[PDB]
């Protein structure tokens, strides 16, 4: 090759690596962070970000009288001088003492001893994770950061000989570091838990630190939040000595009537991560924090004074960090404290920084959340970003209250205030400022999230769960209310969101129906707890090993598996494999028998029903395994054991097909000689009842403590039926013309030995329980003599079920076309006093996808883990479900 073409490839490699390194630099310094979730509790009844949006958009003024349950001497501490205050109303969280101690594992002792800042912050973080489409329980072990802007407002009062009740927990319950630490401890997060003390700027500084941590790869996701609560009214008294609080309590932000600043409570948290990570993981992006900046003023006229130069510098630094021109943003969530000193300085800083070269028809629209709820304090910036996020989402800037006129202290003649709401070529961008009293100015820039199907599975279960039944009812009511205000949501998307993006709690319920006319009433009946046809409820077991159960005959009905053959492709594939295995050892096809094709034999014949039952059971068990329910044990019943022997891995498909087909064919001559009769009695009573007939009859199967099947000759069977009718015993004759598990099979014994010849047994992968021996059996021992004994010796289903329950097994999934042994299994379970729950797959005249999903939902409600991804899908459109319905209780410290 020439030298030129040789060096060309090296140049190409070099420039590609150069581009890769430059892109690495760009994503390592100027990476856009994605706000994937948020959660706020602010005064005025606001509990969700949507509550905040409807509050601020409506122009509601969320300032009301002081709380009366906090022990304050509210009638006495009002004086419009020495140690009193001249304000009688501010933004308060009257439910600040309300907290769900049990949900997070916290004790009432620790809860009352714990700062309400931590109590609010835990719930806010949990809701923020839930609103991001993330399951908080699945966040355990992840490198998730926690950055909280909080402060020691004083709830236990360490300087005052902390009370006897909160003794021992006044460090853990009140250190400001533990406010961030407890989130990670409860949620199991691994990223750093750092709390920031910066007075009225801590939350936005925490967002800055979270952004820097995520950009450096120290975290995968992060919690950037703030909290403010007022255990004592000192913040009003200390700031009343200087005329800093407004006389009426309204934060007249940037208004000519600006005369002070009223404080307020509130918690506000964001769950954020890298934008590329959000796109890769398929999380919904609410907004994009492009850049951030923080600095100081230092040379301010007094320590607690502002500085226009510092505010301009941080604004310009934030703009440069995001790589955005000042004219790019068309809105600012100014601090807007309302002070006479602070407002003109902030307005001058905004005018100098942002509005200097903007077009003559797009002024910068300035507003403040403080006019609505008052000064939140630490949680001010992280609430302002929520306000701007929802303003971008709804495409309208809400009005800022109490602006009778723009303040005359600044020359507006570029920038205009949001006196009334205003509506909105290029992405929407907005700034937020969190200037503090300690001089730490902060500023962030947010941008509109960038613009981002599968067929609907029928009868998609809707899953609900909660820690307690009352919480479950609250969850159902909340979901019903949410679905009422929605124009025709997609039910499969709701099913996916409920199954995947919400924790499975203890008390569970499910709604399985294929029509969008019963789900509403079912949700209601769940809400008031009434029963419903398409509703299932239960208490999931913490631990327990799973069992597959394979009964013998009886679980047959025409058309079984017909609907599943069309609807379910996995079941069709398994039936096809069974048919291919069976073809060589029989003179017809399984699919024709199941589909009821013309001329195919019916289920009356013994030789065709048993292979059909085997194939259906094996296919159903494999479908269960495909849905993620891998058995911990398998048990059978007569011919069903062969199917169990296939699922355990001891017998290949060909060997099991050979055994079942040849065994049934060798059982054909027994037809008409005798039959079975099921009578409900103990084993000893049946045994001593069959004594006069001697060898004619025998105990065919001990299904349960009060359910035994006896097999024998037709004449003796009728004689015993008449005797039971005389004795008033509920004896039922099974529809079978052949007396299996009786002496008659000896007549065909050698032929049975021919049925199992040539097989290749293997050790069991899954522990198989032989109903003949009554305990686990090695897989290699399944020889011809074993199968002959299975056909001949009495089944001991009750004994092996008792032994299996003794081994910690707690779930019994019948893989039949219709439950036949569920009664006996439940009888044994209640006899031994265990908490095991029995389930079935299909039911008579019910074999479509709806019944399959009903069985799966019942199993999940009983506590069996189910891979809902396979049932529903890998990824559907995101759906915003309501957060957890906490059952709160009052927790406050008394003097």
């Amino acid at each position, epitope marked *: *090759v020439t030298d030129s*073409e*040789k*060096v060309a490839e*090296y140049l*190409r490699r*070099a420039t590609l*690596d150069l581009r890769a390194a430059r892109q690495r630099i760009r994503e390592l310094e100027s990476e856009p962070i994605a706000i994937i979730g948020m959660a706020c509790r602010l005064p005025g009844g606001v509990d969700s970000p949507e509550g905040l949006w409807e509050l601020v958009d409506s122009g509601t003024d969320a300032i009301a009288g002081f709380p009366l349950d906090r022990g304050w001497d509210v009638e006495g501490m009002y004086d419009p001088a020495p140690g009193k205050t001249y304000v009688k109303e501010a933004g308060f969280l009257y439910d600040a003492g309300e907290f769900d101690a049990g949900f997070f594992g916290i004790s009432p002792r620790e809860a009352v001893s714990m700062d309400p800042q931590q109590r609010l912050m835990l719930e806010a973080s949990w809701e923020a994770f839930e609103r991001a489409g993330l399951d908080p329980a699945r966040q355990r072990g992840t490198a998730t950061g926690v950055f909280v802007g909080a402060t020691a407002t004083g709830y236990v009062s360490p300087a005052a000989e902390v009370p006897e009740g909160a003794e021992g927990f006044a460090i853990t319950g009140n250190m400001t570091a533990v406010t961030s630490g407890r989130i990670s401890y409860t949620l199991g997060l691994q990223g750093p838990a750092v709390t920031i003390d910066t007075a009225c700027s801590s939350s936005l500084v925490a967002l800055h630190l979270a952004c820097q941590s995520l950009r450096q790869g120290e975290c995968t996701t992060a919690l950037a939040g703030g909290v403010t609560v007022m255990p004592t009214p000192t913040a009003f008294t200390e700031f009343s000595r200087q005329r800093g609080l407004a006389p009426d309590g309204r934060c007249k932000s940037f208004a000519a009537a600006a005369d002070g600043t009223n404080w307020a409570e509130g918690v506000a948290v964001l769950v954020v991560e890298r934008l590329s990570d959000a796109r890769r993981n398929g999380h919904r992006v609410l907004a994009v924090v492009r850049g951030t900046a923080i600095n100081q003023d230092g040379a301010s006229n007094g320590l607690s004074a502002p500085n226009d130069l510092a505010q301009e510098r941080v604004i310009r630094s934030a703009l440069d960090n995001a790589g955005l021109t000042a004219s790019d943003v068309d809105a600012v969530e100014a601090h807007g404290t309302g002070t006479t000193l602070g407002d003109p300085i902030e307005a001058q800083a905004l005018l100098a920084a942002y509005g200097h070269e903007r077009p003559a028809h797009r002024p910068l629209r300035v507003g403040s959340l403080k006019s609505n709820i008052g000064h939140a304090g630490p949680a001010a910036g992280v609430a302002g970003v929520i306000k701007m996020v929802m303003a971008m989402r709804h495409g309208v800037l809400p009005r800022s209250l109490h602006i009778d006129e723009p303040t005359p202290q600044v020359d507006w003649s570029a920038v205009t205030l949001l006196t009334e709401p205003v509506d909105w070529d290029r992405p929407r961008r907005a700034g937020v400022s969190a200037f503090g009293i300690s001089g730490t100015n902060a500023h962030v820039i947010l941008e509109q999230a960038p613009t981002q199907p599968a067929p609907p599975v029928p009868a998609a279960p809707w899953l609900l769960s909660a820690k307690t039944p009352a919480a479950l009812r609250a969850q159902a009511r909340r979901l019903h209310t949410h679905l009422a205000r929605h124009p025709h949501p997609d039910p499969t998307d709701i099913a996916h969101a409920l199954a995947t993006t919400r924790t499975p709690h203890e008390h569970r319920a499910a709604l399985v129906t294929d029509d969008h006319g019963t789900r509403g009433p079912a949700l209601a009946a769940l809400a008031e707890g009434a029963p419903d046809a398409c509703l299932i409820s239960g208490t999931a077991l913490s631990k327990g090993r799973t069992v597959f159960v394979f009964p013998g005959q009886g679980s047959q009905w025409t058309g079984m598996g017909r609907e599943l053959l069309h609807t379910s492709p996995e079941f069709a594939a398994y039936i096809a494999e069974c048919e291919t295995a069976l073809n060589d050892f029989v003179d017809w096809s399984l699919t024709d028998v199941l589909r009821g094709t013309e001329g195919a034999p019916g289920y009356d014949r013994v030789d065709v029903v048993q292979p059909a039952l085997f194939a259906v059971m094996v296919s159903l068990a494999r479908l269960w395994q495909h849905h993620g329910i891998h058995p911990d044990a398998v048990i059978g019943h007569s011919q069903g054991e062969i199917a169990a022997a296939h699922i355990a891995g001891a017998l290949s498909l060909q060997d099991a097909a050979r055994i079942v087909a040849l065994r049934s064919q060798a059982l054909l001559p027994l037809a008409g000689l005798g039959g079975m009769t099921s009578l409900a009695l103990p084993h000893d009573q049946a045994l001593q009842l069959i004594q006069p007939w001697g060898q004619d009859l025998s105990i065919a199967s001990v299904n349960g403590p009060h359910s035994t099947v006896v097999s024998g000759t037709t004449h003796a069977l009728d004689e015993l039926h008449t005797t039971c009718d005389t004795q008033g015993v509920r004896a039922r004759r099974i529809p079978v013309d052949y007396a299996s598990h009786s002496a008659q099979v000896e007549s065909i014994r050698d032929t049975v030995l021919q049925a199992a010849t040539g097989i290749n047994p293997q050790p069991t992968t899954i522990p198989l329980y032989s109903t003949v021996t009554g305990q686990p059996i090695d897989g290699t021992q399944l020889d011809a003599d074993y199968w002959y004994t299975n056909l001949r010796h009495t089944v001991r289903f009750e004994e092996t079920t008792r032994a299996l329950l003794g081994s910690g097994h707690r779930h019994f999934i019948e893989t039949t076309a219709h439950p036949v042994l569920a009664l006996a299994l439940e009888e044994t379970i209640e006899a031994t006093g265990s908490d095991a729950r029995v389930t079935g797959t299909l039911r008579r005249d019910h074999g479509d996808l709806t019944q399959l999903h009903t069985a799966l939902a019942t199993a999940w409600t009983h506590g069996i883990d189910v891979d809902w991804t396979a049932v529903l899908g890998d990824r559907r459109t995101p759906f915003e479900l309501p957060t957890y319905a906490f059952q709160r209780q009052r927790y406050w410290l008394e003097p």
Partner: antibody
Amino acid sequence: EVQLVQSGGGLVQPGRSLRLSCTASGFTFGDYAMSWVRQAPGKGLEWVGFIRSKAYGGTTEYAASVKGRFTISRDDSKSIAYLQMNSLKTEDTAVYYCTRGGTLFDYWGQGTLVTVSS
Amino acid sequence: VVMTQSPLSLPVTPGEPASISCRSSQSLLHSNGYNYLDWYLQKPGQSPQLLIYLGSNRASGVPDRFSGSGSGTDFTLKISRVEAEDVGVYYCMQSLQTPRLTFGPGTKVDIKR
């Protein structure tokens, strides 16, 4: 993101033709010179051949042991490289690797195991 | 004709660095001041991948622990941190003379004990 996916292997008795396709997705296939490099079982890498880019002329060169028998072509419209192996010999059993760059093999395909014997 | 040779094998352990050296039979430093040499890695069961080109320039996506060095005839690939994922065959392969008949015997790298 650059991707090279090979196909067209399978058992072949000696002395017939075979085609190995290798599709490229994630870069400008036209500018790159494209190479095939085989590796017999247990032996080291052994370069087979390459083709220049269409801009350079599209000419082909091959290793000394594969004069005439082997051929290289490229569908630039759909961006696949084709190795036509005519008259396979019993010693051509190897794992043929598909690589970008004539002289510098920056990225390699998964490799197709072509086994030949009577 | 140019000939390149490296040690046949070099046992390594995770816990201490290593250096795979190799020497050419000719001065590979081209007139343009570049040693026309490359270093490739082939892991067991995976296709070969590039590590170094032109003696010292590392390829993007390669771990930073790898570093090529040397000039003229003598070259080395120094690995600061040895990991089980890095076990394989390392080929130092020239490009001054073309066409290249074969990569060469390479240098097997394996866990030392």
